[PDB]
Amino acid sequence: KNRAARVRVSKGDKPVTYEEAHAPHYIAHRKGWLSLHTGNLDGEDHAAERTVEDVFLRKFMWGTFPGCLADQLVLKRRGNQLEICAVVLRQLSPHKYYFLVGYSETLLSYFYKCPVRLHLQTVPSKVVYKYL
Amino acid sequence: SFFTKLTADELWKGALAETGAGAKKGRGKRTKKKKRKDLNRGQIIGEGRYGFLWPGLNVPLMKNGAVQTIAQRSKEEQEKVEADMIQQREEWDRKKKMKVKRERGWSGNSWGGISLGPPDPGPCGETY
Amino acid sequence: YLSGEEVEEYECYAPD
Amino acid sequence: VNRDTTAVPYVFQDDPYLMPASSLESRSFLLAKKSGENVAKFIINSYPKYFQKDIAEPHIPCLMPEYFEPQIKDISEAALKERIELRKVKASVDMFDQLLQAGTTVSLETTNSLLDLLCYYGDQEPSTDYHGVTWRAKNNAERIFSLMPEKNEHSYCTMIRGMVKHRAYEQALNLYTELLNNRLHADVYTFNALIEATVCAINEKFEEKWSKILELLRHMVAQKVKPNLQTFNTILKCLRRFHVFARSPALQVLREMKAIGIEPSLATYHHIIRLFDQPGDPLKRSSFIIYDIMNELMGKRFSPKDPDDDKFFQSAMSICSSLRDLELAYQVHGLLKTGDNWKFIGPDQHRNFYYSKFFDLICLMEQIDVTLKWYEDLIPSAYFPHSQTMIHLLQALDVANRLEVIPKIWKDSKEYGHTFRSDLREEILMLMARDKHPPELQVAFADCAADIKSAYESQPIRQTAQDWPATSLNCIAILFLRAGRTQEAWKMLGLFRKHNKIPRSELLNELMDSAKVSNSPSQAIEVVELASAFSLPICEGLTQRVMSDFAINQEQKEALSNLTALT
Amino acid sequence: PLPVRMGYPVKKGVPMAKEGNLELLKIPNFLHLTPVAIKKHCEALKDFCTEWPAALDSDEKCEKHFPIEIDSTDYVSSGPS
Amino acid sequence: LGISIKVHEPPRKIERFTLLQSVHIYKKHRVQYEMRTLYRCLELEHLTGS
Amino acid sequence: HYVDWRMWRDVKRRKMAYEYADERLRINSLRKNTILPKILQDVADEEIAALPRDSCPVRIRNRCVMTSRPRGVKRRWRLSRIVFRHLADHGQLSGIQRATW
Amino acid sequence: NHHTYAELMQTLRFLGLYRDEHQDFMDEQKRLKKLRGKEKPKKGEGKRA
Amino acid sequence: AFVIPKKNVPTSKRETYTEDFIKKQIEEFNIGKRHLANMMGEDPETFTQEDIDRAIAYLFPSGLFEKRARPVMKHPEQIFPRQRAIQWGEDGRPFHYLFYTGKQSYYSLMHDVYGMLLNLEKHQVIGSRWLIKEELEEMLVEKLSDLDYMQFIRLLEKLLTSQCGAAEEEFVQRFRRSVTLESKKQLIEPVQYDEQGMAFSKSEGKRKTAKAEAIVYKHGSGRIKVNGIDYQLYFPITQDREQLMFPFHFVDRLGKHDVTCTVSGGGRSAQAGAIRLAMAKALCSFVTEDEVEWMRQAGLLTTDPRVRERKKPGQEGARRKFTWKKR
RNA sequence: GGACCUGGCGGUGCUUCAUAUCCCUCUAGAGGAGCCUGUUCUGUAAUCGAUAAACCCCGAUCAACCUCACCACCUCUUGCUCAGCCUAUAUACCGCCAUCUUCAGCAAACCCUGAUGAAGGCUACAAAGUAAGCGCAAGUACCCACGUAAAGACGUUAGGUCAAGGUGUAGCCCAUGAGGUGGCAAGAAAUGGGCUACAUUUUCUACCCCAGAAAACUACGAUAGCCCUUAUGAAACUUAAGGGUCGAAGGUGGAUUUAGC
Ligand SMILES: [K+]
Ligand SMILES: [K+]
Ligand SMILES: [K+]
Ligand SMILES: [K+]
Ligand SMILES: [K+]
Ligand SMILES: [K+]
Ligand SMILES: [Mg+2]
Ligand SMILES: [Mg+2]
Ligand SMILES: [Mg+2]
Ligand SMILES: [Mg+2]
Ligand SMILES: [Mg+2]
Ligand SMILES: [Mg+2]
Ligand SMILES: [Mg+2]
Ligand SMILES: [Mg+2]
Ligand SMILES: [Mg+2]
Ligand SMILES: [Mg+2]
Ligand SMILES: [Mg+2]
Ligand SMILES: [Mg+2]
Ligand SMILES: [Mg+2]
Ligand SMILES: [Mg+2]
Ligand SMILES: [Mg+2]
Ligand SMILES: [Mg+2]
Ligand SMILES: [Mg+2]
Ligand SMILES: [Mg+2]
Ligand SMILES: [Mg+2]
Ligand SMILES: [Mg+2]
């Protein structure tokens, strides 16, 4: 039986998001990609470097906004701009979200030597697609 | 390696071993069982070992109408914070350890005679 | 069970 | 593209939970974001090796770590110059002393570059991220200056300017005498500081101060030194104290600027505007000074020339409100909207004051149909309103007889951080309950009064005893009756006794009309029972009304007799 | 201000609403490039353009006056370099 | 802007590759992946450098 | 802080190979022609053989950059098949999808 | 550069700006192993001496 | 009294959309419809649903292969599933006398049909099909079994066999869905004229990876040119020439038309097949309608869909498996 | 010990089935020969894992050094790491999978029957079942609505993998860790899979299908052996390519067995 990225059926009490509910074969069919860049197009270079950067940015934001992320990150690159779009919860005070936005944008801009912007969308609770 | 690190959920699912041929048929018994613990429970965003005070994250942003600057707790002032977190951690462990004992039934290991409470309220605002 | 089982509002714009 | 009126300023996160909901959060959210940036820069500069991998092409110099430490550890002149560029006051002094004790020669240009550093900061270390008069009597600057072997004009100039900057006015004038005794010539910048010292050195009458300044200016012409913009701007800034005495002298400086060829900046008019805007009747003079200043500035794009250029608009709007001239305010705002003049508005404190006086003048002197266009364009896009402007807005709706908008102002007030303002909720309720209205409007006023009631009930001062003003309780109850929510009105009567608040005469009379319609004698007695507790004179007359109007049961008749016994 | 929905719906369900919708966040939207905006943008960019010579009406005429052709290529990719 | 533009769609490229599905052994069981590259070509003519 | 000691050895091999690349290139040029005397080429053979063993580029191994797996690595992403799939199967690799045809 | 990534994020954890859930997990397992008597020996003072 | 853990969360259940919800969703769609029209600079009054779908595809471009997962801004009626209304009032009395059957709509329909069959007794195909169960389940707004569907259909057929009048015919047509029959008749290419005024037709054909384009002239001597070469020089294999002969021979027109065709891709046999199909399609312009139907029934106008199958991983070929190792 | 129920099993009955499918039928193979490659066994100072179906060109889309985890010798001890360990345990696990599956079932919450026993719950001219959710299905990918992919729940074999990485438990910490130098990986044999053959529907050349020669001890047949050159590399009796020499078994393969609509 296939296991990869499959949330398994339970008793109907496990809330899953839209992303978690779709196995890999639905990628590009029912769900899109979480990162968009040109490195994986035919005739394009530097796919390895973009991939490592994406793995770091996902771990960095998970630990920088602990318990606040309500879904996976969406990473967008246009030219040298890096846009991080995150859906977060409404538990932390707004002052702490502004501190971490200023802190994260600045630290990441100096780390990867590019203008980095962080876009936060707040939700009252994790959006539930279905109960498995 | 930083890239070999996993999330807390992944680490507990592995360590607990709740899914497996051991837990399928109760092939494994648990006199000693790994118990899940939430390690982010008493943790404050912005608090680290070095004891830095970040205005707007772990200390107030404005003090006396003026914006606070970056500061660091003294070595002694930081020891107290660390000790206080350990005591707060043992207090939490003791609060969970303090659980009200329920009366026994016909015998200590018997279910017979134990009260289960009133039946659940029916859908149409019925109560028992 | 006999040891015990102890697993154990208003909103405002611009709060303070 | 133009400004988006439904949005808060671009610096804020465009999210309803993260958008600022008040002027206080507007300031604090930006300070919290700036704090995070400083924490990042502190880390970047503390651990630069983590941020040294440069993968950017082309190279980005502004995204690399900064090194604030000297890398030359030899003791020599070329190593001192490094500590002067980094602005290390103590290290540079120590390096200068050791270099001097060893007997090596330190150039003059370098010795001056050390004074510019000490004289500017006052022999104190500039602020860093993390590790009265201020011209210290024991200061390295004076010592090095004395030990100096050869002293040029530049050496004295930096000593005189530093003293004036740190408020050592008397010492700076004494040093200006030696410069003349030594047959030296000062620069314009030194003269600018000496003009400030002449006025601030001692307290004297204007005529005495005005004679010294004219002597400095004539000395500036003897030494073939040409005055700059700051020379004339310092004179006007220093004449602020004398007010009426300096009004005509100040206008002599401005006319001289035009002739000489120096162009007045925004600061030049800010100082003149502040000088003429003394407490008193502004109509006599201030009226025609601001009218002529705006005709001159009409359709002019401004460039930064003086540090005080970001104060003209705040000063100019302040007089238009005082004069109560709305056409002048539009011209001032028109000047702010020509080209890139919007950048001279000033810091956040000046931006909110400018828009507060501007909008408060619109609500007063402008038609209500246009007032609501500015209300939509300015708030919250341009600034968050103070609770006193919401009141100025309600007073404008009243004068226009447009009270269907009151429930909107309450919704907006909550979204701007005025949910728990007492002066505001009382104002809203009084206007809503001042007079009776058609049934459609009366129902709407009862939906807002209910929401206000909830605000009084769920205040964040709930830890302290809830303060329910008498007017608020009377108005909220009256609005329920006129809307037909009599059940809610009757319940509230208990709160008059709980908080010991006097019931209003109008409320008691309207309660009777709701009883006679329901033909409920008990409720009618409950009204007479309430007024009896407070010993109101209308009660004794009301008891007569209740007798005739309502059938009085024997128990009710005895109850009235009990109140009659109290009478 | 659009009631746009996205997401494969569950049985007897509807596509998910825009609030908290990651699928709509994953899209490279063109909301900044509406036909109204493009036309306003291009009216301001006309002042930066120059006029092609009218004499060069056809490719054969260009070849006559300009016999040399120089081809170069620029590559726009996303990244720091 | 008054520029003459033609458009066409060059043929797409799909790059496929095969990987083992299991961490260990089970050679005959693979997972196949692909990257699809689609093209659009805007051809502008008779325009100045400005 | 590298994944394992074997990745650390390859890190050093890549560092030393980069440092000696020019020296080996120049010496090899002397050995890879029939123009110079054998007496000179025999000396160049000894010179390139005397360089440090880890300067030789054939000893560099393309290991997974996240797991140090020496085989099953896809050069374009420098990831093992297992690590690639984990990212691919969660939609974290731009433009990569499961292939059906 | 696995050094930079590990050292950068380790420094940020000590500064309180990054929560390393994995490291926190390892710290709890190491803490509970001391109370159980399974502590790491001193170098040179191993079970064999 | 004592505590047992609570069984479940009530939200973990199927939802329902009240009438008031749909009423407010329609106000949002109409306001958003005017916003979207303002975004695209179009008249909000004449803004149709086709315009909305086009504007949403531009503003929110999605390449997801399944259209149902793409951004959509439709009228709530289209989006939200139809909801059965309350089946009783405030007093609790069901509205329909067959409520307690659980299938009141289905049994009310059977009751109406059974009653009509009785009244008739007291009184006394190609273009249409019966609706499918999934369409009956929507007219009734109920769930049906397969046997429930059959029993209803068996009862309608029993109603056609009777002397049903006009009133008994409008009712049956409510459950007859027109079945559209596709025309198999071959489309005829237009007859063009060249510079010299000779009538000709042009068509195309595909076989495997071979693609052919043939020009058949109305009058000729039987010359066939393949990429400028005589067909017997281009096709030295006799079977490839037999394929070129088949279309003309089958209609008795050998030596009556000239052909100039171009073919690329595939092998020798695949190219001959593509030319056969291209020539036959073009030849249909010069034969009678009955002859075109005879060519169709002979397989001369059908594109062969048989193309190479992909190899699968874990097996030697498209179908052949690796040897099952000896046990 | 009596009676009953479930499961397993029956050299257990009956009926209907399997569609490249159990047998026969159809086509090309394997089983014999040489070679390539895996495994076993033996050998060696000298890894490990997979190992009935569901291991055996399997982890490896790959081992001359490196890789490497093995052996021998020498060397280091806060050690690339706020150490390390490819040490034990896949019968603690996560992760990723095999298998039935070339299946269609699983199943929460209720309801009812059996006296409220373990248990059971279908009849359409219907007799107690209603069933969310998951799977199938639908939909999507490829050239169609076809086919092929993909998908394929729960569960079965404590199936495979601690040596992808991570990790519980236990163990080592002057060594069970780290580095250096050299070295092993053979074949007395057995066996799996594959390649090339035994030839005339063939062999060689031209051509890419109207040709001329070859055709049994100078034929067909080695991709083997031996010798030489070249390519890659710092390093090649070794790895690959080419040439020369050499011209072997093999003469279409018993029981048995594989694949294909
Ligand atoms: K049995
Ligand atoms: K054989
Ligand atoms: K397992
Ligand atoms: K492992
Ligand atoms: K382990
Ligand atoms: K074989
Ligand atoms: Mg499979
Ligand atoms: Mg006991
Ligand atoms: Mg290699
Ligand atoms: Mg085949
Ligand atoms: Mg054999
Ligand atoms: Mg084994
Ligand atoms: Mg094993
Ligand atoms: Mg087995
Ligand atoms: Mg070695
Ligand atoms: Mg080796
Ligand atoms: Mg070891
Ligand atoms: Mg197992
Ligand atoms: Mg199909
Ligand atoms: Mg398959
Ligand atoms: Mg399916
Ligand atoms: Mg096992
Ligand atoms: Mg060892
Ligand atoms: Mg040979
Ligand atoms: Mg060589
Ligand atoms: Mg021969």
Q: Which of the other chains make 3 or more beta carbon contacts under 8 angstroms with chain E?
A: A, D, F, I
Minimal C-alpha gap between D27 and chain A (Å): 11
Please name the residue that has the structure tokens 């600061």: D267
What's the CA angle centered on B122, arms B116 and B127, to 5 degrees?
70
Give the C-alpha separation, I90 to I18, whole Å.
17
User: Are chains A and H touching, using the cut-off of 8 Å on CB pairs and a minimum of 3 such pairs?
Assistant: yes
* DSSP letters for I26-54: HHHHHHHHHHHHHHTT--STT--HHHHHH
Q: What 3-state class would DSSP assign to F36?
A: strand
Cα of B109 vs centre of ligand 8, distance in Å, is 6
In Å, what is the CA distance from D502 to each residue of B7, D498, D506, D531? 63, 11, 12, 9
Cα Rg of chain B (Å, integer): 24
Cβ-Cβ contacts under 8 Å, E37 against chain I = none
Single out the residue of D313, D229, D211 nearest to residue D270, CA to CA: D313
Cβ-Cβ contacts under 8 Å, B117 against chain I = 1-4
Classify residue G101: in a domain, yes or no. Answer: no
- Which domain does G83 fall in, by range? 1-91
Cα of I326 vs centre of ligand 6, distance in Å, is 11
Cα I74–chain centre separation = 23
Please name the residue that has the structure tokens 């066939």: I224
Give the C-alpha separation, B114 to I34, whole Å.
66
The burial class, CB within 10 Å (0-12 / 13-18 / 19+), for D149 is exposed
In Å, what is the CA distance from G84 to each residue of A4, A51, A62, D133, G96? 12, 10, 21, 67, 10
Among the partner-chain residues A4, A28, A42, the one whose CB lies closest to the CB of F15 is: A42
Q: Is I62 on the interface with A (CB under 8 A)?
A: yes
| H helix runs in D60-149, sequence order | 77-85, 89-101, 108-121, 140-147
Give the C-alpha separation, D488 to D90, whole Å.
75
Could you tell me the distance in Å between the CA of residue F19 and the C1' of nucleotide J23? Answer: 40
Q: Are I172 and I164 in contact (CB under 8 A)?
A: yes
Classify residue G12: in a domain, yes or no. Answer: yes
Classify residue G7: in a domain, yes or no. Answer: yes
Pairing state between β F30-37 and A116-123:
unpaired
Give the C-alpha separation, F49 to H6, whole Å.
49
Classify residue G49: in a domain, yes or no. Answer: yes
Could you tell me the distance in Å between the CA of residue I242 and the C1' of nucleotide J221? Answer: 40
Of all residues in chain G, the one with the smallest CA distance to B4 is: G66
Among the partner-chain residues A15, A28, A131, the one whose CB lies closest to the CB of I64 is: A28
Cα of I323 vs centre of ligand 11, distance in Å, is 14
Closest nucleotide (CA of A12 to C1')?
A: J133
Residues 6+ apart with CB under 8 A from D146: none
Strand order in the sheet with G96-98: F13-20, F30-37, G96-98
Of all residues in chain B, the one with the smallest CA distance to G5 is: B1
- The contact set of B with C (CB < 8 A) is 96, 99-104, 108, 114
Single out the residue of D428, D377, D374 nearest to residue D405, CA to CA: D428
Q: Which tokens is I39 given?
A: 């975004």
Give the C-alpha separation, I106 to I104, whole Å.
6
Please name the residue that has the structure tokens 């009240």: I18
Give the C-alpha separation, D407 to D444, whole Å.
7
Helix pair angle (D470-483, D505-518), 10° resolution: 30
Residue D270 corresponds to which amino acid? H
Q: What 3-state class would DSSP assign to D491?
A: helix
Element (H, E) at D373: helix D368-378
The burial class, CB within 10 Å (0-12 / 13-18 / 19+), for G48 is middle
How many helices (H) and strands (E) chain A has is answered by: 2, 6
Closest nucleotide (CA of G59 to C1')?
A: J66
DSSP classification of residue B54: -
Give the C-alpha separation, I148 to I143, whole Å.
10
Residue D564 corresponds to which amino acid? T
Residues 6+ apart with CB under 8 A from D376: D5
DSSP classification of residue I115: H
Could you tell me the distance in Å between the CA of residue F19 and the C1' of nucleotide J230? Answer: 36
Minimal C-alpha gap between I315 and chain F (Å): 7
Give the C-alpha separation, I62 to A32, whole Å.
9
Q: Are D423 and D467 in contact (CB under 8 A)?
A: no
In Å, what is the CA distance from A129 to each residue of A18, A86, F15? 5, 18, 33
- Chain J: nucleotides below 7 Å from protein CB are 29, 49-50, 52-69, 77-82, 84-86, 91-100, 108-110, 124-126, 131-134, 139-144, 146-156, 158-161, 164-175, 177-182, 191-194, 208-210, 232-235, 257-261
Classify residue G33: in a domain, yes or no. Answer: yes
**Stated length of chain D:** 567
Helix pair angle (D505-518, D521-534), 10° resolution: 160
Minimal C-alpha gap between E14 and chain I (Å): 6
The burial class, CB within 10 Å (0-12 / 13-18 / 19+), for D418 is buried
A11 φ, ψ (degrees, to nearest 5): -100, 5
Single out the residue of I132, I142, I138 nearest to residue I102, CA to CA: I142
DSSP classification of residue F28: T
* Percent helix, percent strand, percent coil in chain C, to nearest 5: 0, 0, 100
Could you tell me the distance in Å between the CA of residue B24 and the C1' of nucleotide J94? Answer: 16
Q: What 3-state class would DSSP assign to E18?
A: coil
Pairing state between β A116-123 and A81-89:
parallel
Q: Are I272 and I243 in contact (CB under 8 A)?
A: yes
Give the C-alpha separation, D242 to D239, whole Å.
6
Pairing state between β G73-74 and F41-45:
unpaired
Inspect the interface and report whether the beta carbons of C3 and B99 lie closer than 8 Å.
yes
Residues 6+ apart with CB under 8 A from I83: I16, I17, I19
Q: What 3-state class would DSSP assign to B53?
A: strand
Of all residues in chain D, the one with the smallest CA distance to B71 is: D130
Of all residues in chain E, the one with the smallest CA distance to D16 is: E19
Cβ-Cβ contacts under 8 Å, A55 against chain B = 3
Cβ-Cβ contacts under 8 Å, A28 against chain I = 63-65
Give the C-alpha separation, B59 to B55, whole Å.
5
Could you tell me the distance in Å between the CA of residue I324 and the C1' of nucleotide J104? Answer: 27
Single out the residue of I124, D39, I115 nearest to residue A101, CA to CA: D39
Give the C-alpha separation, H49 to D479, whole Å.
91
Cβ-Cβ contacts under 8 Å, G101 against chain A = none
**Sign of the torsion formed by the C-alpha atoms of D209, D215, D218 and D220:** negative
Closest nucleotide (CA of G12 to C1')?
A: J80
Asked how this structure was determined, the answer is cryo-EM
Residue D415 corresponds to which amino acid? E
Cis check for the bond before C15: say yes or no (omega within 30 of 0). Answer: no
Classify residue G81: in a domain, yes or no. Answer: yes
Cα Rg of chain C (Å, integer): 19
The burial class, CB within 10 Å (0-12 / 13-18 / 19+), for G47 is middle
Pairing state between β I192-193 and I176-178:
unpaired
How many helices (H) and strands (E) chain D has is answered by: 27, 0
Please name the residue that has the structure tokens 């002969």: I245
Classify residue G52: in a domain, yes or no. Answer: yes
User: Are chains E and B touching, using the cut-off of 8 Å on CB pairs and a minimum of 3 such pairs?
Assistant: no
Give the C-alpha separation, I306 to A90, whole Å.
59
The burial class, CB within 10 Å (0-12 / 13-18 / 19+), for D9 is middle
Give the C-alpha separation, D64 to D54, whole Å.
8
Q: Which tokens is D528 given?
A: 């007479």
| H helix runs in G1-97, sequence order | 5-19, 21-31, 38-49, 81-89
Counting the structural domains of chain G, the total is 1
Give the C-alpha separation, I28 to I30, whole Å.
5
Helix (H), strand (E), coil (C) string for D125-178 = CCCCCCCCCCCCCCCHHHHHHHHCCCCCHHHHHHHHHHHHHCCCHHHHHHHHHH
Q: Are D433 and D461 in contact (CB under 8 A)?
A: no
Cα of H38 vs centre of ligand 23, distance in Å, is 23
Q: Are E4 and I72 in contact (CB under 8 A)?
A: yes
Closest nucleotide (CA of G34 to C1')?
A: J230
Q: Are A67 and A97 in contact (CB under 8 A)?
A: no
Q: Are D89 and D121 in contact (CB under 8 A)?
A: yes
Cβ-Cβ contacts under 8 Å, A72 against chain G = 90
Classify residue G8: in a domain, yes or no. Answer: yes
Residues 6+ apart with CB under 8 A from A95: B56, B61, D28, D29, D32
Q: Which tokens is D447 given?
A: 């939906």
Resolution (A): 3.1
Give the C-alpha separation, G78 to G62, whole Å.
7
How many helices (H) and strands (E) chain F has is answered by: 0, 4
- The contact set of D with H (CB < 8 A) is 39, 43, 47, 49-50, 53
How many CA atoms, within 13 angstroms, populate the side-chain half-sphere of residue D122?
Answer: 12
- The contact set of B with H (CB < 8 A) is 1-3, 5-8, 11-12, 37, 39-40, 43-50, 52, 54, 57-58
Cis check for the bond before I5: say yes or no (omega within 30 of 0). Answer: no
Single out the residue of H10, D42, D63 nearest to residue A63, CA to CA: H10
How would you label D280-301 residue by residue, b for 16+ Cβ within 10 Å and e otherwise?
Answer: eebeeebbebbeebbeebeeee
Give the C-alpha separation, A67 to B40, whole Å.
8
Residues 6+ apart with CB under 8 A from A7: A14, A16, A20, A21, A132
Cβ-Cβ contacts under 8 Å, I69 against chain E = 6-8, 15, 23
Ligand nearest to the CA of G5: 17
Residues 6+ apart with CB under 8 A from D104: D76, D77
Give the C-alpha separation, I293 to I288, whole Å.
9
Residue D18 corresponds to which amino acid? L
Q: Which residues pair with F17 in a beta bridge?
A: F33
Q: Which tokens is D299 given?
A: 């359709």
Q: What 3-state class would DSSP assign to B71?
A: strand
